[PDB]
Amino acid sequence: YVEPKFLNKAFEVALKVQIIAGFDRGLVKWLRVHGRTLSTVQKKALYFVNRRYMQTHWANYMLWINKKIDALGRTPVVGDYTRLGAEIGRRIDMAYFYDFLKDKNMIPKYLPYMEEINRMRPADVPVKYM
Amino acid sequence: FLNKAFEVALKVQIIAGFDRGLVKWLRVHGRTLSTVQKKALYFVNRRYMQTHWANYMLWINKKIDALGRTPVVGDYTRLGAEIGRRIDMAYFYDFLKDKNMIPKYLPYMEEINRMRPADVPVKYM
């Protein structure tokens, strides 16, 4: 049984900012090559994909992050989360997911709620994680 | 473009095939899926038809013109039923699941789910 834990704010924001900057840079590179054929709303839907992907993998990422943080010995500083966040942002094969979407013609229908998330600072994108 | 009794038989069979498949697929791995997830997959079914409707028309008219004289609704119903039998969506369902990317269940989706397949909108190229 686990009681709720609240990640230190500076740590959490560091992780988010770095994961999404990486994802976004990767999308920019990918679009440079493949975005030729995409509308604006499809491009926006792929930005939403990046934020969503972080949302539904967050527990997967916190698993890994906490193991790394714990194999540290000492108490973590925000520098440790900026660093783990940047690794995740550049290690994840987002390009494959984008390629799948484009090939299957199943880039998500761009909907109003997706604009709600895309307009936030990446630092504020909400996750649901105890 | 195509007729309303035509397009109708076309949409109602295709969605029926897809839906049968998802049912089968949920039968096998629907265990750890919430309700909104499953509804998400039903929506996927409906949006997949819509994004590949054109393609469907190419194969469809084909078999439609390669038979003889003008066809009947009985023809369409069977066409779309075949179509609804050919596309194996299980791969899509598995990819989204594996990737943890069953889409967010949103109001437009519930809408499109709630309609009758007969009315689910489509678009000729």
Domains of chain A (ranges; CATH) run: 1-130 (1.20.150.10)
- DSSP one-letter code for B104: P
Whether the Cβ atoms of residue A61 and residue A88 lie closer than 8 Å to each other:
yes
Whether the Cβ atoms of residue A17 and residue A85 lie closer than 8 Å to each other:
yes
Method for this entry: X-ray
Query: Tokens standing for A92?
Result: 């994840």
With CA atoms as reference, report the closest residue to B105 among B116, B115, B113, B117.
Answer: B113
- The span from the CA of B66 to the CA of B87, in Å, is 22
CB contact under 8 A, B47 and A113: no
Query: Tokens standing for B65?
Result: 């013109």
User: 3-class SS at B105?
Assistant: coil
Identify which of A97, A100, A108 has the shortest CB distance to residue B103.
A108
With CA atoms as reference, report the closest residue to B125 among B54, B46, B55.
Answer: B54
Query: Tokens standing for A51?
Result: 């934020």
CB contact under 8 A, A113 and B101: no
Neighbours of B120 (CB within 10 A): 20
- The span from the CA of B103 to the CA of B95, in Å, is 12
What string of DSSP letters covers A79-114? HHHHHHHHHHHHHS-HHHHHHHHHHTT-PPPP-HHH
Cα B6 to its chain centre, rounded Å, is 15
Nearest CA to CA, how far is B51 from chain A (Å)?
Answer: 6
Identify which of A97, A108, A114 has the shortest CB distance to residue B99.
A97
Å resolution of this model?
2.1
Query: Tokens standing for A106?
Result: 């199943």
With CA atoms as reference, report the closest residue to B57 among B14, B19, B92.
Answer: B14
